[PDB]
Write a protein that binds this ligand. Structure first.
Ligand SMILES: [Cu+2]
Length: 128
């Protein structure tokens, strides 16, 4: 809807959508993430992480190194613009960020950094 999107991550490692549009009239933007299915976080947890299309693989690779307790994200990782926490089934998390942080003329991506997930759990973000 305007200024908020509700996205699901399930047990076949699918995100409900894989392209999000972010209206520029919005001052902040909120992502609400939930997890259907019944599998726990240590084997099937999902987060929602944002970076440039170009920064993604680095973020995914160093996130894997940080481990589960760090929610597979390197602390104070300067390339992430916003991210949720890693959640298991029945869990929910939300993240709001300033839309001013998204520059026009750049390509951004949303992905699940949990190891092995990112290949399927990835999508584009358009600022319009
Ligand atoms: Cu995932």
């Amino acid at each position: 809807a305007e200024c908020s999107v509700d996205i699901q991550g399930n047990d076949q490692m699918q995100f409900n959508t894989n392209a999000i549009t972010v209206d520029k009239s919005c001052k902040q933007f909120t992502v609400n993430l939930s997890h259907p299915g019944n599998l726990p976080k240590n084997v099937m947890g999902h987060n929602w992480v944002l970076s440039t299309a170009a920064d993604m693989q680095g973020v995914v690779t160093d996130g894997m190194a940080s481990g589960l307790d760090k929610d597979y994200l390197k602390p104070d990782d300067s390339r992430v613009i916003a991210h949720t926490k890693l959640i298991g089934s029945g869990e929910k998390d939300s993240v709001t960020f300033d839309v001013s942080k998204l520059k026009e003329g750049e390509q951004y991506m949303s992905f699940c950094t949990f190891p092995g997930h990112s290949a399927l759990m990835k999508g584009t973000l358009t600022l319009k």
